[PDB]
Write a protein that binds this ligand. Structure first.
Ligand code: HEM
Ligand SMILES: CN1C(=O)[C@H](Cc2c[nH]c3cccc([N+](=O)[O-])c23)N(C)C(=O)[C@@H]1Cc1ccccc1
Length: 383
């Protein structure tokens, strides 16, 4: 099954800590249990620092960056410093101020769609425009430039790309973004890029290339992870629309419902890698210093012991805390924004198009088995 994540690390079907080779052959202990995963991810002995001997990104494309990564591949003091430059933008209190804008962006797209004859690729026609417009508004990216940024993001996220292909992607992406860093003048005043450039960059809290790091990561997490999550939520809707009764009868439960989609559809499908900095016992296993590990989110999000009937999409759970956004210091800084988008986007589209069914067979859809984050390359829906 394409909607069940047990194919990624088949070894974990058999054991809660499972030894496996990564793309380049490096072995890595895969943690599949929720507590173990939570443990790995706030332990100081597991590091996101890619410059360390033996660090192995989960795809070759990302490997290409290890020697000079964005902040997602840093430890303190740098992590605190870099994340610090923009953390304040994504405080739930500030992101809430975007809700009506977001809600407008959504109504915008649904207004388009309402006149269009089905079927439609709801990725291209609903999820991506919502998601991308939202973060591009926040960032201040020119409209002109979004098709390109879109293309290049698919590059970064490829799990089939090579290390030399990935270098070029990032090179190209980086040169674009460097262009805005060096000339912020064409960007809106209420733009996150501009605040970052004229503020902490000019104040030299970070370098030119660190700045590009920051922005690049908001461009990537800002819409690809969000636009897929939307997409798959629709797939679940298409398959089981009377589970979504709630949207109509229980609006105050939408927030839960979103969480439950975050759990079920853990798009960070390969989990998160970490390197041990000294020997550490977790989940009854000693991890020798310098060993890679993988925190398998989507399986931790299906760990029956914490989530009864995990393979069932179930909006009647009392609030339960998925590690969809990860955990620890590197936990998704954009999580607040994506919650909002999903809260606004998914209800909207169900209400305006509740006969949304799949315009072709589940087994025919092109699921992203070749991407570092999951989802679908196209989602033909009729209604
Ligand atoms: C469904 C939506 C999203 C999912 C599932 C997602 C998932 C994640 C995960 C798992 C990480 C952990 C990386 C690690 O620990 O090694 C992460 C980090 C990050 N996410 Fe997201 N995210 C989403 C949305 C966003 C959005 C909307 C933004 C920005 C607008 C964003 C920006 C980031 C950044 C900058 C990081 C790096 C955190 C750090 O190293 O300090 N994410 N995200
Ligand atoms: C969960 N996840 C990832 O592990 C990776 C990130 C990454 C892991 N190692 C990286 C090395 C360089 C650049 C990036 N980058 O900019 O996304 C990376 N990507 C790309 C992803 O789409 C997702 C979501 C995400 C995007 C941006 C920053 C954090 C998370």
């Amino acid at each position: 099954s394409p909607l069940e994540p047990y194919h990624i690390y088949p070894e974990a079907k058999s054991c809660p800590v499972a030894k496996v080779g990564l793309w380049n052959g490096t072995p890595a202990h895969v943690f599949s249990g929720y507590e173990d995963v939570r443990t790995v991810l706030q332990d100081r002995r597991f590091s996101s620092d890619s410059r360390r001997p033996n660090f192995t990104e989960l795809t070759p494309t990302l490997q290409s960056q290890a020697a000079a990564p964005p902040f997602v591949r840093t430890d303190n003091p740098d992590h605190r410093r870099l994340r610090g430059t923009i953390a304040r933008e994504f405080l739930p209190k500030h992101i809430e101020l975007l809700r009506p804008a977001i809600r407008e962006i959504v109504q915008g797209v649904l207004d388009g769609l309402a006149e269009t004859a089905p079927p439609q690729d709801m990725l291209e026609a609903f999820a991506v425009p919502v998601a991308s417009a939202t973060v591009f508004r926040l960032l201040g990216i020119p409209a002109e430039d979004r098709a390109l940024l879109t293309r290049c993001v698919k590059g970064v996220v490829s799990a089939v790309g090579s290390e030399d292909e990935g270098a070029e992607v990032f090179r190209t992406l980086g040169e674009y973004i460097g262009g805005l860093v060096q000339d912020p003048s064409e960007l809106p005043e209420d733009s996150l890029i501009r605040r970052l450039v004229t503020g902490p960059y000019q104040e030299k809290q970070l370098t030119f290339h660190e700045t590009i790091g920051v922005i690049l990561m908001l461009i990537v997490g800002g819409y690809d992870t969000t636009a897929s999550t939307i997409s798959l939520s629709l797939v679940s809707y298409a398959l089981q629309p009377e589970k979504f009764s709630v949207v109509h009868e229980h609006p105050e439960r939408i927030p839960l419902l979103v969480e439950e989609l975050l759990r079920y559809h853990t798009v960070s499908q390969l989990g998160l890698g970490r390197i041990a900095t000294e020997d550490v016992e977790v989940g009854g296993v000693t991890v020798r210093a310098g060993q890679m590990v993988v925190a398998a989110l989507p399986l931790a999000n299906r760990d029956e012991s914490v989530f009864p009937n995990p393979d069932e999409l179930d909006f009647d759970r009392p609030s339960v805390p998925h590690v969809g956004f990860g955990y620890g210091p590197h936990q998704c800084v954009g999580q607040a924004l994506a919650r909002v988008e999903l809260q606004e986007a998914i209800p909207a589209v169900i209400r305006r198009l509740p006969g949304m069914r799949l315009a072709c067979a589940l087994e025919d859809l092109p699921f992203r088995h070749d991407m570092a984050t999951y989802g679908i390359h196209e989602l033909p829906m009729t209604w």
